[PDB]
Amino acid sequence: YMGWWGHMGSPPQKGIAGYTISPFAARPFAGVVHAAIFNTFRRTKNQALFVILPVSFFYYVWTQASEKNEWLYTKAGRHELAKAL
Amino acid sequence: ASITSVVKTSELILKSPLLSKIVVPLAKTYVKFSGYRQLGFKMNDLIIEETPNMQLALRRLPPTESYDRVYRLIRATQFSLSHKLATGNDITKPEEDDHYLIPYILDVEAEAFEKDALDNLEVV
Amino acid sequence: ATTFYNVFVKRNSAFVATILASAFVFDMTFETAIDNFWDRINAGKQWKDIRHKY
Amino acid sequence: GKSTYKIPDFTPYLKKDRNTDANRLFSYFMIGSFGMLSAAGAKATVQDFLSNMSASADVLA
Amino acid sequence: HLGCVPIGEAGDFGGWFCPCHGSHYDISGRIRRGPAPLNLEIPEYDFADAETLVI
Amino acid sequence: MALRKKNSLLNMANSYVLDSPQPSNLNYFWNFGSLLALCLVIQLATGITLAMHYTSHASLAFDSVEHIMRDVNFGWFIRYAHANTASFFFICIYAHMGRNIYYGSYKTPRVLPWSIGVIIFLLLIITAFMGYVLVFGQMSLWGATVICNLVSAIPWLGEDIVHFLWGGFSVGNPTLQRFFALHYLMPFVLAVFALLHLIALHTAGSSNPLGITSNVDKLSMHPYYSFKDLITVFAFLLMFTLFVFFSPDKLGHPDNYIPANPMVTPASIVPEWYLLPFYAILRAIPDKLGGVIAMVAAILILLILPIVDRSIIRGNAFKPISKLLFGFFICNFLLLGVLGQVHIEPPFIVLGQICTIFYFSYFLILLPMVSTIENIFFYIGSL
Amino acid sequence: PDPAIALHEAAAEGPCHDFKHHFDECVERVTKAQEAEDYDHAEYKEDCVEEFFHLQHCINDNTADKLFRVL
Amino acid sequence: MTAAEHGLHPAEYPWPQNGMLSTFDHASLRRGYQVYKEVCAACHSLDRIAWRNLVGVTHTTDEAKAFAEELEYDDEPDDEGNPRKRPGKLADYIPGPYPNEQAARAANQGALPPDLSLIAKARHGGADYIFALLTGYPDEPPAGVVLAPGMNYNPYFPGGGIGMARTLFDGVVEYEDGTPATTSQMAKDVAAFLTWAAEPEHDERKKLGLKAIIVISAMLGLSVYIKKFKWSPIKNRKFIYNPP
Ligand code: HEC
Ligand code: HEM
Ligand code: HEM
Ligand SMILES: CCCCCCCCCCCCO[C@@H]1O[C@H](CO)[C@@H](O[C@H]2O[C@H](CO)[C@@H](O)[C@H](O)[C@H]2O)[C@H](O)[C@H]1O
Ligand SMILES: CCCCCCCCCCCCO[C@@H]1O[C@H](CO)[C@@H](O[C@H]2O[C@H](CO)[C@@H](O)[C@H](O)[C@H]2O)[C@H](O)[C@H]1O
Ligand code: FES
Structure with missing residues (x-):
């Protein structure tokens, strides 16, 4: 499923003209400030839910579990601990 | 899963009035959130092609459809590496998201599956 | 800039010689610089600072 | 859009002084600095690391 | 409990007393009082003779 | 013809590091492969150097490690580098595996590199476990004891196998000397399998974040990915430097600075952090043999991803529901890690069981269902 | 004398007063309970370790930096 | 687990060596060695430290040679193969107070005082734990705690009952640099010294x-x-x- 240079396995290409300029002719950091602020904000905003929802859910579960565990091993939690074991 | 499977199940749903009433709106939002149109892809450009059946279907595409697919893949790759999205006419509009490849793969698979059946025939 | 390019950069043999000689200088001077800076931020704490009492 | 002799717009990226020696020299200064720190870092790494094989403090004692 | 060696004949069940966290073993060397969870482990031993055991 | 192409030896290197055609759109998550190669090189260099100063005999092992710390020139660095790079190796391998799962790298035609990859991961676990024993501190001994006793669960022969592994009736000198020999060996085996999975991959080439073919648009590995790999190499070396020079013991257990004592049992015996999720899965099943099977199954189940993923599309970039499920799967795997090092107490016992069910149901139920439904939504939604 | 003594006393009377009073009340209860007979044959014997920990943790928070400043 | 079973967590003290760019205070290291030598060394060894290790850290070559030369170490047997002693050298390790574990336990009501060379790395807390432990013996155990005989209450020690009694009291040491030897000062110095011993x-x-x-x-x-x-x-x- 992959060939090599000259016979890579692409369907025939026709009609595409590609253009580019030399690394010495270009400013490598052109538009960096716009990218760093606006591009990163867009990319991050669009993926935020997929991180926030699972992280926040599992952090909540952990927080509840660790707080209960802590309370069961106090004096106040003696009776509830006795039942739990 | 085979394209045949996907197409048949989809047709069962589209038949049922109740089912279509609840599934079609979900499917449309799914496609909007999927975001492949924002890289100028058509849905069928995403189908896995590294299989004998798919290689055969792609070889049967008309030359123009095949040249246009190559350009969409190259253009999408350039958006991906640049971390940009399509703008303007590069965005695939819902009316342009045509199933150009589905009929070819369904024919290839029809033969492949008939061959499997007939390889197991028992003279009665 | 032409002159500098022609002498130190154009021939890779010269470019590599310049890089290696610079690395030698960097290494020696950086060592001395960090040693002094380290001694100033940690003044009165190190053995060298209390050694004179003994 | 159609003519392939109309080069796409590269003005947002093109440097005006692109053919000058100063232009090349700057990029080679960055490459050279990187090669220089890599050489000094390699030397430090090799020297400190290989010194493990020289007589240890208990042996020198 | 944790693995100190109990001082024998001492205790409160007059068998063995671990001084570490104050766990009391019996004359069977069974745990009676203190943090220790189990009775003092028995090795695999056999009486080859009536006068010699092998462990 | 260029020499790099004509000469058969040069041509093999050329095919993998120079002319190798890559997709032009690999993102930074494609950099973990070269970071793993870097960890492997650091472990070989530091490990062989430690072997020149370490003594595998149980009477001298712990003290030989103290001699390395105290007397050998730069011994402290070599030891801390080796111990911290073991943790970095696992961070990179989990990242690399997470990349592979998110982007569908296990799908045809890459089932073979993925399957060999699962074995690489098993070899890394064994290598790291044996290396940890070599210190012969308290965690070394008690970790060896608890983990090696899981083999006693094998029916009929289990006890015999344990005594055979230990070379005696408990973890002691014979065990330590054999672990040293195998710990030295296993990284070489691991390097061979790492090479095998790359040769297997070379038939299809790298996948890419869009999940489509890159045969239309290839870039040479060098110079593009050589220079992109340097960025993450230097980022890695910055993290390495912060741990090795400023906090060398943050990832370790203080009990491993107490010499092994078969009498005193440590308060809590836990594996190194990177094994903690598998330990939580083992605890979840009450049966001894059940727990061992579940724990091994947790790794071997990765082999069925090629089958249970029913999607017609490779990878998750365009699959919102799959992306949500993957996020929950990953966070669950981290929670299992945390539960691996809590005490066996309420309510963490039941939570560990629920998280274990979620872990397995991802492979057996959720991924097959979600991937089926997304197929239908893509088809209907684009009609 | 030991600077810690003064700092600890000041922190107990000041920022850690609630915890000081909790510990005190606990001590009073436990001592009284020990005074009562058939205490030795009781199921649950209360201690004041918890309250002590809350107080000491508080004193340490308010003292650690001050103490090391005068050494 | 109960908080008592864990032990109270020590405060974070601002050590001179805390800080990416900060060394130990070597004057504190020297004072801490003097606390080790005059207090801790009665029960605790420091077996991983040789006299040469002190040189150019806490002491000059001559001071450390003088400490070594005051002790006797086992020499090679003489010509008839009889045992002999020699004076100490810089290469020698600092000798411990007891000949074996059994002797150590007999002198400490069954408890074995650990070697202190790695103690700052072998305990959660490090210097903070050592400082908290040495300065954290309350005059009276919290009401209701029953100590086993020969145990002392210390909240920082897991379980609360430690076999080591309080040892640092104002003026047990007279520092050679004129520093007031308060409990706090001595605990700080010896904790710093032990930290150095763990990670020189x-x-x-x-x-x-x-x-x-x-x-x-x-x-x-x-x-x-x-x-x-x-x-x-x-x-x-x-x-x-x-x-x-
Ligand atoms: C005369 C006896 C004695 C003196 C003096 C003594 N110790 Fe100890 N120490 C012990 C004993 C016994 C233990 C073991 C206590 C136990 O495990 O219950 C111990 C334990 C310790 C521990 C470990 C506690 C733990 O977490 O296991 C440290 C740290 C310690 N000592 C430091 C010191 C320092 C620092 C000094 C003096 C500056 C000191 N000791 C003086 C007898 C002593
Ligand atoms: C994948 C490669 C490797 C991994 C993941 C690995 C992992 C480990 C780990 C986790 C330890 C315990 C470290 C500690 O806490 O002190 C260790 C110790 C050790 N390893 Fe390795 N190792 C690897 C390769 C090697 C190799 C190739 C050697 C060659 C002999 C080696 C020699 C040692 C030695 C001698 C020790 C004990 C001394 C010490 O603890 O530092 N290792 N290894
Ligand atoms: C020593 C450990 C390993 C090393 C050095 C290593 C190295 C690499 C390298 C260099 C690549 C090509 C570049 C890249 O995609 O990052 C790669 C690709 C791959 N590796 Fe690994 N690998 C290791 C372990 C694993 C493991 C544990 C797995 C799977 C469980 C795995 C599965 C793969 C797969 C499927 C690919 C192809 C990914 C793709 O390009 O789409 N590898 N590996
Ligand atoms: C192909 C490569 C060629 C051969 C490689 C050379 C192998 C070993 C040579 C030098 C190793 C020992 O060389 C010695 O290194 C250590 C640092 O590592 C230096 O020591 C210097 O820094 C160290 C810590 O960085 C300090 O403890 C020391 O007080 C200071 O003098 C010595 O100044 C140098 O004399
Ligand atoms: C990664 C470190 C660098 C060392 C190289 C790794 C060692 C593994 C190499 C041995 C495995 C055999 O590797 C195999 O070699 C041949 C030529 O070399 C490659 O062949 C490829 O390149 C050559 C020209 O570059 C073409 O003739 C051929 O059409 C193409 O498929 C195979 O795609 C590769 O699978
Ligand atoms: S060690 Fe025996 S009672 Fe805790």
Whole structure:
């Protein structure tokens, strides 16, 4: 499923003209400030839910579990601990 | 899963009035959130092609459809590496998201599956 | 800039010689610089600072 | 859009002084600095690391 | 409990007393009082003779 | 013809590091492969150097490690580098595996590199476990004891196998000397399998974040990915430097600075952090043999991803529901890690069981269902 | 004398007063309970370790930096 | 687990050596050695430290040779193969108070005082735990705690009952540099000294780390410029498509 240079396995290409300029002719950091602020904000905003929802859910579960565990091993939690074991 | 499977199940749903009433709106939002149109892809450009059946279907595409697919893949790759999205006419509009490849793969698979059946025939 | 390019950069043999000689200088001077800076931020704490009492 | 002799717009990226020696020299200064720190870092790494094989403090004692 | 060696004949069940966290073993060397969870482990031993055991 | 192409030896290197055609759109998550190669090189260099100063005999092992710390020139660095790079190796391998799962790298035609990859991961676990024993501190001994006793669960022969592994009736000198020999060996085996999975991959080439073919648009590995790999190499070396020079013991257990004592049992015996999720899965099943099977199954189940993923599309970039499920799967795997090092107490016992069910149901139920439904939504939604 | 003594006393009377009073009340209860007979044959014997920990943790928070400043 | 079973967690004290760029205070190390020698060394060994280790850290070559030369060490047998003693050398390890574990336990009501050479790394808390433990013996155990005989209440020790009694009291040591030897001061000095004993490379390690951080950061910045420079023809590429 992959060939090599000259016979890579692409369907025939026709009609595409590609253009580019030399690394010495270009400013490598052109538009960096716009990218760093606006591009990163867009990319991050669009993926935020997929991180926030699972992280926040599992952090909540952990927080509840660790707080209960802590309370069961106090004096106040003696009776509830006795039942739990 | 085979394209045949996907197409048949989809047709069962589209038949049922109740089912279509609840599934079609979900499917449309799914496609909007999927975001492949924002890289100028058509849905069928995403189908896995590294299989004998798919290689055969792609070889049967008309030359123009095949040249246009190559350009969409190259253009999408350039958006991906640049971390940009399509703008303007590069965005695939819902009316342009045509199933150009589905009929070819369904024919290839029809033969492949008939061959499997007939390889197991028992003279009665 | 032409002159500098022609002498130190154009021939890779010269470019590599310049890089290696610079690395030698960097290494020696950086060592001395960090040693002094380290001694100033940690003044009165190190053995060298209390050694004179003994 | 159609003519392939109309080069796409590269003005947002093109440097005006692109053919000058100063232009090349700057990029080679960055490459050279990187090669220089890599050489000094390699030397430090090799020297400190290989010194493990020289007589240890208990042996020198 | 944790693995100190109990001082024998001492205790409160007059068998063995671990001084570490104050766990009391019996004359069977069974745990009676203190943090220790189990009775003092028995090795695999056999009486080859009536006068010699092998462990 | 260029020499790099004509000469058969040069041509093999050329095919993998120079002319190798890559997709032009690999993102930074494609950099973990070269970071793993870097960890492997650091472990070989530091490990062989430690072997020149370490003594595998149980009477001298712990003290030989103290001699390395105290007397050998730069011994402290070599030891801390080796111990911290073991943790970095696992961070990179989990990242690399997470990349592979998110982007569908296990799908045809890459089932073979993925399957060999699962074995690489098993070899890394064994290598790291044996290396940890070599210190012969308290965690070394008690970790060896608890983990090696899981083999006693094998029916009929289990006890015999344990005594055979230990070379005696408990973890002691014979065990330590054999672990040293195998710990030295296993990284070489691991390097061979790492090479095998790359040769297997070379038939299809790298996948890419869009999940489509890159045969239309290839870039040479060098110079593009050589220079992109340097960025993450230097980022890695910055993290390495912060741990090795400023906090060398943050990832370790203080009990491993107490010499092994078969009498005193440590308060809590836990594996190194990177094994903690598998330990939580083992605890979840009450049966001894059940727990061992579940724990091994947790790794071997990765082999069925090629089958249970029913999607017609490779990878998750365009699959919102799959992306949500993957996020929950990953966070669950981290929670299992945390539960691996809590005490066996309420309510963490039941939570560990629920998280274990979620872990397995991802492979057996959720991924097959979600991937089926997304197929239908893509088809209907684009009609 | 030991600077810690003064700092600890000041922190107990000041920022850690609630915890000081909790510990005190606990001590009073436990001592009284020990005074009562058939205490030795009781199921649950209360201690004041918890309250002590809350107080000491508080004193340490308010003292650690001050103490090391005068050494 | 109960908090008592864990032990109270020690405060974070601002040690001189806390701080990416900070060494130990060597004057405190020297004072801490004097606390070790006059108080702790009665029950605790420091077996991983040789006399040469003190030199140029806490003591001069001559001071450390003098400490070594006051002791007797086992020599090689004489010509009839009879045992002999010799005076100590810089290469010798600091000798411990007891000949074996059994003797150590017999002198400490069954408890074995640990060797202190790695204790700062072998306990959660490090210097803070040592300082908290030494200064954290309350005059009276919290009401209701029953101590086993020969146990002392200390909240920082897990379980609360430690076999080591309080040992630091105002003026048990007379420091040679005129520093007032309060309980707190002695605990701070000896905790610093023990930290040094656990990790004697500390000062050098952090300075080499500073050099590494600087070089690696520069290399990272340059590698970003070089990557962007090399990639710009790919990033800047443009297409015109005329469908055939
Ligand atoms: C005369 C006896 C004695 C003196 C003096 C003594 N110790 Fe100890 N120490 C012990 C004993 C016994 C233990 C073991 C206590 C136990 O495990 O219950 C111990 C334990 C310790 C521990 C470990 C506690 C733990 O977490 O296991 C440290 C740290 C310690 N001592 C430091 C010191 C320092 C520092 C000094 C004096 C500056 C000191 N000791 C003086 C007898 C002593
Ligand atoms: C994948 C490669 C490797 C991994 C993941 C690995 C992992 C480990 C780990 C986790 C330890 C315990 C470290 C500690 O806490 O002190 C260790 C110790 C050790 N390893 Fe390795 N190792 C690897 C390769 C090697 C190799 C190739 C050697 C060659 C002999 C080696 C020799 C040692 C030695 C001698 C020790 C004990 C001394 C010490 O603890 O530092 N290792 N290894
Ligand atoms: C020593 C450990 C390993 C090393 C050095 C290593 C190295 C690499 C390298 C260099 C690549 C090509 C570049 C990249 O995609 O990052 C790669 C690709 C791959 N590796 Fe690994 N690998 C290791 C372990 C694993 C493991 C544990 C797995 C799977 C469980 C795995 C599965 C793969 C797969 C499927 C690919 C192809 C990914 C793709 O390009 O789409 N590898 N590996
Ligand atoms: C192909 C490569 C060629 C051969 C490689 C050379 C192998 C070993 C040579 C030098 C190793 C020992 O060389 C020695 O290194 C250590 C640092 O590592 C230096 O020591 C210097 O820094 C160290 C810590 O970084 C300090 O403890 C020391 O007080 C200071 O003098 C010595 O100044 C140098 O004399
Ligand atoms: C990664 C470190 C670098 C060392 C190289 C790794 C060692 C593994 C190499 C041995 C495995 C055999 O590797 C195999 O070699 C041949 C030529 O070399 C490659 O062949 C490829 O390149 C050559 C020209 O470059 C073409 O003739 C051929 O059409 C193409 O498929 C195979 O795609 C590769 O699978
Ligand atoms: S160690 Fe025996 S009672 Fe805790």
